[PDB]
Amino acid sequence: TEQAEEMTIKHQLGEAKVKKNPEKVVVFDFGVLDTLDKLGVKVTALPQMNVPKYLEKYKSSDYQNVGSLMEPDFEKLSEIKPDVIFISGRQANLYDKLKEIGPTVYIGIDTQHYWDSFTNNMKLIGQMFGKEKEVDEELANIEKQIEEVKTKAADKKALIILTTGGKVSAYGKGSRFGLIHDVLGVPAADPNLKVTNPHGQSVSFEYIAEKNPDYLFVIDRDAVVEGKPTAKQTIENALVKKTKAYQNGHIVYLDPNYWYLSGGGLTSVSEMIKQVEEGLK
Template sequence: MRKTPIFILVAIFLTVILAGCNSDASSNAESAADSGELTIAHKLGETVVPKNPEKVVVFDFGVLDTLDTFEVEVTGIPKENIPAYLSKYEDGQFENVGSLKEPDFEKIDEIAPDLIIISGRQSALYERLSEIAPTIYMENDTQNYMNSFKENVNKLAEIFGKEDVAEEKLAEIDKSIQDLNEKAAAMGENALIILANDGKVSAYGQGSRFGLIHDVFGITPVDESIESSTHGQSISFEYIVEKDPDYLFVIDRGAVVGGESSAKQVVENELVKMTKAYQNDHIIYLDPNYWYLSGGGVVSVAEMVKQVEEAL
């Protein structure tokens, strides 16, 4: 009878020790997972990156948009022409790493980042940036917009442990696109997409920078022969009158890069006023913060869908 309390004490002692060991093992496993590495394949190669990197330099506003949604801290960004809805990154706590076309290599080297993320404008500088830190390239493939967008979001989610957030946001976007497709099909009208830039206009068709309006959202193009290019096909206002679209979607480049004239002044001239789009109040000015500066972000893509859906 006297031995029973001793056995109980020994059992309790062993239980506490084992629980502590399990807790330490669990903590160590989590720590190992957090400090692990991933191999990220991208168009410019394969890059070994740390999981949950602490110091991140971002050269793409769409990527910045997604990381902001994920509540991931970034260290450095190019501070020229930051989209209005991401204006908090103009704050001094974020390092200025140059411009989209001309990175400040000295500043980036000083930061000693754990990860650098680039896109099209910096692709030629990939090797040089890779010498400073692990660098990955994230492309918005206009020929395969949604797949490339989702691939980028999921890669970022994997790196920063945000898979649940990514799954939720992508599901919401998929549902909104499905609803938009149904509305576009029922509407049965066509559209022309143009970029206005200080008195000049360019048209964008299927497979182009803004072609997801046709390719993904399901709105019929007024002209299927528009050449697919980054800078669009230069057109005249007579062309717009000739094609006479039901809807005219306009992206105002000057509004976000310091242009001298507004798109409305340029587009709504006496010729364009002859079109169905103008007469039916179907000239839609899309927000260039989302369409021109930060395409391919979780917020920007959701807003693109929303703006076109509201226009219809």
């Protein structure tokens, strides 16, 4: 039977039509980038202004530079005329501008349904590039990592903090970093904390101390945004020194190259879970 040559992809921002096995692939989501890397799929262009350390090979001049995460180089994109552009939350406001240039797929994670959304995104990439087998195998491996960590979430309450500019914001269930609770089964120090903001909910140090979590997961935003680590200087303060987490050596510094700059790819999700596993074991 003669079938359509294009895929019809209903995504959070609309519908894209993309040639199966598209030639010129542009990527503004580093989770997607690591996924295409893992699968051996050839990428054409990405924003090279700020590339996660683990994806530093994508700094090569072999890839066309289409700007920064927030500031696409539209002229360059228009030269390339891509077959598909993958975007996520940072580029959501630029959807229509990108769509004029080439088929654009929003492929951010819906954090209210992290696992379903993650898996849907990865399977789509598999279908688009004929890598369904490799994706399924890799999702299988990640499930095994999840099953290992869920079995020690136990009586250990965790709070998730991001540091930037000497300030602290928090994340809980259903949030950007909700997977620690929602997928990996770690109970929340504050189960009623509802955060939908990319940069979290501003909290005081007094609030952290009162919640007194067993574990403190910390994401150093300035390490990747400014290129200067500030998390440790920021959180190592007397109110925080009260907490079980500090006292018991259960402050876990998550790698912002993975967690903040990236996320939601085969490699980033795997590595993110390994970082949680390591902190909890």
